[PDB]
Design a protein around this ligand. Sequence first.
Ligand SMILES: [Cl-]
Ligand SMILES: [Cl-]
Ligand SMILES: [Cl-]
Ligand SMILES: [Cl-]
Lengths: 129, 129
Amino acid sequence: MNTIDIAKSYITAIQTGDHATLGSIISPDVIWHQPGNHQFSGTHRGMAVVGPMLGKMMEVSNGTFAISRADDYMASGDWVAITLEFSGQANGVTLKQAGVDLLRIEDGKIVEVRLFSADQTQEDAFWGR
Amino acid sequence: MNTIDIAKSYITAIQTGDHATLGSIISPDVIWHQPGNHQFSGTHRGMAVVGPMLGKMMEVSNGTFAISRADDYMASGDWVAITLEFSGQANGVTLKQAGVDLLRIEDGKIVEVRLFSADQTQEDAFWGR
Ligand SMILES: [Cl-]
Ligand SMILES: [Cl-]
Ligand SMILES: [Cl-]
Ligand SMILES: [Cl-]
């Protein structure tokens, strides 16, 4: 079992809303870097913070924020880049754009997450203040 | 002038073979992570090493290794992810595949590079041993 397997499990769990997997395969000490200039932007540390933030995100997006398509999983050292599309409809914003999730995986767990968006102005409006 | 501007300058310079730009906008102390299992794979530090390695790469690929298409430039903290396609024809291998370049940019310079390839088996064969 390799880092791409773990990354695929992570994406499948996001896509299918499997909180059990997400709560288990993400490190309790996860460092999560969310880009941009909206209420969830910044670096967050620990599932104590990240779990509730993911929940608030689901609330703010009326459950519509989604990785609508995953394209490629690529490994480099302990990192995996996943190229993808995400979408959503909330705060009057129709979100549809390319992104990349960067995951750092160690000992079977995602220890660091850095997200990238192709249109950060649109994503910022989506999440809101 | 922002990190995406620097990333675009970097990609344009690779694409047009502008060694002057590359030699100037890449940090002398650049940390360069090349994935896979071929003769250039591993982490390399310093332009004293990276410059000559880029030259050897051009030689090994008969000057054909190319970023054939750049798709999106995305910023997250001091990192920029560039989704792209690369191609080449060398060592009996026709290379054509998606990739992502991750650049860390500080004070106007690229200080760290991490490359990702969609088909590392094919890229490994391309570069060879
Ligand atoms: Cl998908
Ligand atoms: Cl809406
Ligand atoms: Cl292009
Ligand atoms: Cl050939």
